[model samples]
Target chain A: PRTVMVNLNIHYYDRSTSPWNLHRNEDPERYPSVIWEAKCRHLGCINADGNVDYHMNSVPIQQEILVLRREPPHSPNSFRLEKILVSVGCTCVTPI
Target chain B: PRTVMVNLNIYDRSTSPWNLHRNEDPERYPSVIWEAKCRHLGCINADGNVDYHMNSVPIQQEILVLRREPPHSPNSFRLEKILVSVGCTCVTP
Candidate 1:
């Protein structure tokens, strides 16, 4: 028992508070475009693990998902950034 | 004509008047292992060009230096661990 340390989450912090614990948006054939690439406190809808938490690789900032040239008329609540989900460079290697 | 378009830095932009300062104390931090190895930035690009840069997040981060392992050799390889460099399955013919 080498001090067992395996609460194991390596600082993703439950996918960063699970995007404020999510609400709906669970991937419609991979973001079918209803508009909304990023937003919080309102405007819920953006999947492909970008949030609205149905879950996937989880954060590295929304698992790098993108698409939305235009469309923003269906507000349930929350809004910000019409479309922006970019970033994918995560290399986790363990050679110990 | 190449228009790579990117600025990667994952898990981010939860903006607001919100300040950013975090440290949940993962043992105050001390997990390392680096003897220094290159030909692994997924492919090499610091002008060597394999591709990586657009806010290049080489799988977390890196920049450890020590130098001289087989050049003239007085013996020096002090690099330590903190890896997440997601690339390079091994290739350099």
Candidate 2:
């Protein structure tokens, strides 16, 4: 709660019966947009329907988080404590 | 808040090599020696330098908060409640 909005991109495994043409012919029923929330870093969330998700955060269709970002809307103090821990599968990232 | 150890795998495309023998000729493709452990959970090899570890490893998804017993032993390590989601694994083959 220091002060920042951070989102991490994680490439989840598809649970479809097959992977060959799933993307090309994706099923909306079996794969819906996934949602996750974080409360004090315990990884929590409440869906739009108000049901508690208590199985796994890996949704077949993930709610893409922070796929886009900006860097220069404020002064250095705005970023001093709000450190974003973005990594993995991002187009701009390199293997470190 | 409770905590649970979670793992994630992300592929790095910058490490590709265009070696002609990588996939066609007999001398290179067969011995590519791709290891799954390094692609997922990184491990220190016998020849790595001291106190050396990889950066931003793909094996880390994010922190998870879950119910756990008070003790930190194997017998006490258990999840009292299950969350809807807390993991990701990417396989590039």
Candidate 3:
């Protein structure tokens, strides 16, 4: 009998906009108010006993950007652009 | 191109009783009670373009009942009943 494993890699981009930057926010045509790059990796392995294991590895390499926006469409409180972007890669191993 | 998909359904239950039932809650032992229910569904699909999609749906309902009694003994509040029931169904496209 033989065991098999698989791995995967991924990447993505993030953008932000705010009220002060309404031009950027309203202009979808314009580049993203803020642009961020991300990368990540995933790994999978099989054991002799036929059991499987998996894990992910990732990190951020860029400074985060923040944007402010009004609340309630007309309220005062503001909103900020804050979210996580993940990039991943995976490796796999098998026994024959 | 052709694609495959899967769907899932789930259901669950819950139950409870007041302190009075357990000889507890000297003050409100026979007073407080509750009931709850929940259900959920999951779906996945693939388009001819080789792309994939997945989704989950859920619903929940619950109720509570309570009674009052003089404060006394090592306990004062009773949990008359705490019940929960749930059901679910799922579909794929």
TM-score of chain A of each: 0.17, 0.15, 0.20
lDDT string, candidate 2, A1-96, tens digits: 222222222213221111111222222221112323321111222222444333212122122222111223322212221212222221111223
- Per-residue alpha-carbon lDDT of candidate 1 for residues A38-62, written as tens digits (9 for 90 to 100): 2222133223334543212222233
How far out, in Å, is residue B27 in model 1? 33
Clashes of each: 14, 9, 27
Where in model 3 is the C-alpha error above 4 Å?
A1-96, B1-41, B44-54, B67-85, B91-93
lDDT of each: 0.25, 0.23, 0.21
Say which docking band candidate 3 falls in: incorrect
Judged by DockQ cut-offs, the docking class of candidate 2 is incorrect
**What is candidate 2's lDDT per residue for B1-93, written digit by digit as tens?**
332222111122212111111222222211122112222232222243222232212222432221223333221222222122212222222
For model 2, name the residue pairs that clash: A42-B65, A54-B83, A55-B83, A55-B84, A56-B84, A56-B85, A57-B84, A57-B85, A57-B86
lDDT of 1 by residue, B1-93 (tens): 111111111122211001122323222211232221233233322243444321122223332222222333332222223433321121111
**TM-score, one value per model:** 0.19, 0.16, 0.16
Of candidate 1 chain B, the 10-residue stretch with the lowest lDDT total is B1-10
